[PDB]
From a paper:
BTK, a validated target for B-cell malignancies, presents a reactive cysteine (C481) in the ATP binding pocket of the kinase domain that has been co-opted for the development of potent covalent inhibitors, including approved therapeutics such as ibrutinib. As a starting point for our work, we selected an irreversible covalent degrader (referred to throughout this study as BTK-cIAP1-Covalent degrader (BCCov)), from a previously disclosed series built from an Ibrutinib-like BTK warhead fused to a known ligand of the IAP family of E3 ligases. Here, we present a study of an irreversible-covalent degrader (BCCov) of BTK as the target, and cIAP1 as the E3 ligase. We, therefore, set out to expand our understanding of target recruitment within the framework of covalent degraders targeting BTK and co-opting cIAP1.
Focusing on the ligand binding domains of both BTK (kinase domain – BTKKD) and cIAP1 (Bir3 domain–cIAP1Bir3), we performed extensive crystallization trials in the presence of stoichiometric BCCov - ultimately yielding a 3.0 Å (2.3 Å anisotropic) structure of the ternary complex in which the covalent attachment of BCCov to Cysteine 481 of BTK is unambiguously resolved. While modest electron density precludes complete side-chain modeling, we can nevertheless observe conformational changes in BTK that are different from the previously reported ibrutinib-bound structure (RCSB 5P9J49). This includes a striking outward flip of F559 allowing this aromatic sidechain to pack against the cyclohexyl moiety of the cIAP1 ligand of BCCov within the context of the ternary complex, highlighting the flexibility and induced contacts in this non-native assembly. Nevertheless, despite the apparent favorable interaction between F559 and BCCov, this contact appears to be dispensable for BCCov-mediated BTK degradation, as the F559A mutant retains potent cellular degradation, binding kinetics, and ternary complex formation, suggesting that there is sufficient plasticity in the accessible conformations to compensate energetically. Finally, we observe a series of intimate lipophilic contacts between BTKKD and cIAP1Bir3 including several proximal to the F559/BCCov interaction with alternating residues zippering at the interface. Addition of BTK leads to perturbations in residues within the C-terminal helices and preceding loops, consistent with the interface observed in the crystal structure. Turning to x-ray crystallography, coupled with NMR, we observe a stable yet dynamic ternary complex in which cIAP1Bir3 is able to contact BTKKD through a series of direct lipophilic interactions. When compared to prior BTK/cIAP1 ternary complexes, this represents a fifth crystallographic snapshot, highlighting the breadth of topologies that can be achieved for even a single E3-ligase/target pair and from closely related degraders.
Numbering used by the authors:
A (entry chain B): 392 to 489, 492 to 546, 555 to 659
B (entry chain D): 261 to 351
The structure:
Amino acid sequence: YGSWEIDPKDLTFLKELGTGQFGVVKYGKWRGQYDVAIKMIKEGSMSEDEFIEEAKVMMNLSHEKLVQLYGVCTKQRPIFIITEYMANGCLLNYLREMRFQTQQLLEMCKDVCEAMEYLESKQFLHRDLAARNCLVNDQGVVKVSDFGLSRYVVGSKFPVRWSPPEVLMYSKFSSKSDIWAFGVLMWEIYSLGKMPYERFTNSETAEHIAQGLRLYRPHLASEKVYTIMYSCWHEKADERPTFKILLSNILDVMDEES
Amino acid sequence: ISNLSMQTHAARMRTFMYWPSSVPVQPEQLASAGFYYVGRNDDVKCFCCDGGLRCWESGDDPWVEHAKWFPRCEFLIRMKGQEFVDEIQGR
Ligand SMILES: [Zn+2]
């Protein structure tokens, strides 16, 4: 109910959470009872007309490992995307802070895979899958966030480290551009918040992933766990796995460890 | 203006005293592009647009990175002009 729209008069701003990729995020109460995160979407970057109509698709997605979108405040500038609050902040700082056991690291990959498998079934694209976008709740569960927003609006920018060769070269987005982005995310998880291709610049990285240079096996990644994330990086996007295939490769290693 | 205490180049240049030597971008071209050192890692803020930048790589131009991320900045435009910004943003 409410037409996916929230009355901004029922939103109480309690504390600032920080600047996200697509706007500044605040913490508060919706109707004085529900803990929410209000994302104020940045002026000038967004068309607003393109978002207002197409957002209805994004809101209808419902999954355990997907940040619950509560509603949007489109009636003003900037628009506010009200979602559930994720106590442990983002995955990127969370790994960097911590030390987990390796079965906890694999489990995190499994939560993101289960959510990507869901979006894959609904023909939806995340486009920007990385540890900075995944959020962690008060229970250490990872939930995917910042999906699709990338499709509503430089020489060499940092997302080059997360993008496959067809994205660097022709800017071709598909379920295979997100399979690759997931393998890179598995690498960030096993490397504990490390930067992908840390020894290379934004521009060097492009003419290296293009040549066939891949991420080295993280110290905590077993030689069979590295096989799963290496599956994700096929030079030819067609010979890459599916979120259902990957989920079954991950669940195989959980039994072959415990 | 966000940090009024850093509107002068020489004020910004003092914050780069604790700048790591390892960072390959110069404190001179950072202070010239409106940036000042915040005190942690390589985090710099524009005194004007409050825009924060970090993870500086070799071959970076603070003015180009200023226009790549904060192009509507009322200082970047007053110093380098819209014709510089449009060439960077529209790349
Ligand atoms: Zn600025």
